[PDB]
Amino acid sequence: GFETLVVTSEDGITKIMFNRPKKKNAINTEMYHEIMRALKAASKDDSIITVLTGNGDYYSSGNDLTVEEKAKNNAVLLREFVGCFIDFPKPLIAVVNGPAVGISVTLLGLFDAVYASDRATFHTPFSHLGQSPEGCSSYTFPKIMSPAKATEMLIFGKKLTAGEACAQGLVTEVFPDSTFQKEVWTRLKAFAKLPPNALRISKEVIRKREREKLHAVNAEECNVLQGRWLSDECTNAVVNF
Amino acid sequence: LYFQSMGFETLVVTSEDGITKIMFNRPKKKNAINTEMYHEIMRALKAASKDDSIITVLTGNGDYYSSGNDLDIPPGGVEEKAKNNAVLLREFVGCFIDFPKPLIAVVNGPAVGISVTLLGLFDAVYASDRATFHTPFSHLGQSPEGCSSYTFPKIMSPAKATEMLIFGKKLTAGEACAQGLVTEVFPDSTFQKEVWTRLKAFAKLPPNALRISKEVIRKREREKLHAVNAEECNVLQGRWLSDECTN
Amino acid sequence: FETLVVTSEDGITKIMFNRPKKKNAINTEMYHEIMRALKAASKDDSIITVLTGNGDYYSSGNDLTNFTDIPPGGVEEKAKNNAVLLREFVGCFIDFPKPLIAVVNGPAVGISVTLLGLFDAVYASDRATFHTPFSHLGQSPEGCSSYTFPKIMSPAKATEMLIFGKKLTAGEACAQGLVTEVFPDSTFQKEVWTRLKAFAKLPPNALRISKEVIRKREREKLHAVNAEECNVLQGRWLSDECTNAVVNFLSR
């Protein structure tokens, strides 16, 4: 089973829900491995669409504020983690139920659609903790949002409302919080009735030609990040947090 | 190769005031694109590429822009039919990729299918607010075409393009403008006046400068676009032979 | 510097265009001065570099007086030289290693707009307008805009600016991806500088390295695009269309 996730499947939809509500669904080492196991399963299961979502208040507070060998290992872990999203074969949808921070935001550039509650916020304060972008965001975010918008978020740590994230290309659509659940699931159940192989083959035509590039971006990002974790600037920034 | 107008069976093709206008002309069929119209569009584009016009416009007659592909098996079966349609598609999309002059769409009404996906290859797109945009490929058991699998994520962002291309969502003119597919939307009652006043203005700009500027923008993308086209057409061949497409 | 004012404080180097009586038009000397200002800024102790204009304009772009400075080698040599100069100017922006922010205080035109595509952020007054009338001038795109504008704004929007010479309001440029944010003119300086001074307090290696991971893998493409745009211009400049245009615009 799963300690940190609740994974369910029915009617052509697999739902992966982060399940550390007391910790704002902060991603610890366990959850990194569990998310990868769940995605590996979903890639081979009978579902047409896979959804990631959060339990409760937050979608995710991002990497859990939990040694050269540790930075190597974590960089290796991170690279494999990101690689699962890059290689994921079926439509992948984020259902962003509340605030989203860190690696949980950056991965959104690898998702096929992203629905957000009006109470969702989006925040990538990497530079504030003395680190660099990951999840391929160094490549995807400038492309999605434009460099002039991506920069405020990636380099300068501006926090976006769900409306702003929608306007800037990161979010497909925003629903009021009161009916968010209803509105998203009625849509997704509708999508799960579409010809299965058509959906799968359509995403492959869109994604396949980009994967080699996205894997190289990931590798570059994790290298830089490994460097940042070993730096005095990062330890001081994080200690000073 | 023509003087003022060139007769076609499914198109009206005219040239005045520095603008070649290519208009779909099957209004009783919602300007659906049949085999005849694919070949006729290709000939018109070849002609427009060589005539003295500065700008070329694609539009529809009547209430639709185009309802897209119009819904006989050769001796080598449905497999050969699939390859033949894939080859025709590839050459067709190719003519749009390689078109050397500014190419503008005047979307007077609903656009569906291949007529929408090619808009990714246009220089400008002017829509009436009663224009709607729909690419229900997946609903018909098919996959993207017209280089949309590449151009649409780029233009609209993946998050918006997926909903259009994979899940078959229909966009209003305003949504398509908000998401970068449409240059500008006009009220239907001003549409023809406003669009044609601009276009006639545009056609008075220094002609070589307009052509050379389009070419600086587009030339270095062509090899990639031709490669996307070939891949999409190859995938589509397989879809057309699948249970989902037929059933 | 004759045509710029370069200062540095609070972790920010400010390069300000300084020909207000000529709408901060970029003459030959200003091209060289900007390159030198960026060279100095690349190695100084600031963490953010800002470009802005003095007076009511950001910049009116290339100074058309630049076409009248005819060397002893004639217009052919001049065309070749100025194309190389342009190539190396734009390449300074492509290669600039620290966060580079435009503070667009008023109307911006031509090369001054196109370069915005290579900046990290762009903050504009609601008095700012953006115009790239290359076609009116019988010219073709520069500053990598032939690649960056379609990517940033979408082909459908980029064409109207680049080919057909539409002038954008600050709000439209913000809506279309060129500008990060727009502020009321009355509060613009205080709102922008309050922000920039906070940004300058962020861990400086993180800021530098984050920019490098975003920008480094795209630089070879950008240099190739710049090289091709410049090769075309070298031709355009010697066209009847550009000659006739420049004689008209010089009469304005």
From Swiss-Prot, chain B:
Keywords: Acetylation, Isomerase, Mitochondrion, Peroxisome, Phosphoprotein, Transit peptide. GO terms for cellular component: cytosol; intracellular membrane-bounded organelle; membrane; mitochondrion; peroxisomal matrix; peroxisome. Signal peptide: none annotated. Abundant in heart, skeletal muscle and liver. Expressed in CD34(+) T-cells and CD34(+) bone marrow cells. The keyword Transport does not apply. In the C-terminal section; belongs to the enoyl-CoA hydratase/isomerase family. The modification N6-succinyllysine is found at K30, K154. The keyword Glycoprotein does not apply. One of its GO terms (biological process) is fatty acid catabolic process. The record marks E145 as: Important for catalytic activity. It catalyses: a (3Z)-enoyl-CoA = a 4-saturated (2E)-enoyl-CoA; (3Z)-octenoyl-CoA = (2E)-octenoyl-CoA; a (3E)-enoyl-CoA = a 4-saturated (2E)-enoyl-CoA; (2E)-tetradecenoyl-CoA = (3Z)-tetradecenoyl-CoA. Able to isomerize both 3-cis and 3-trans double bonds into the 2-trans form in a range of enoyl-CoA species. Has a preference for 3-trans substrates. It is an enzyme of class 5 (isomerase). Substrate binds at S67, G68, N69, D70, L71. Its EC number is 5.3.3.8. One of its GO terms (molecular function) is delta(3)-delta(2)-enoyl-CoA isomerase activity. Residues 20-187 are annotated as: ECH-like. Pathway: Lipid metabolism; fatty acid beta-oxidation. This is Enoyl-CoA delta isomerase 2.
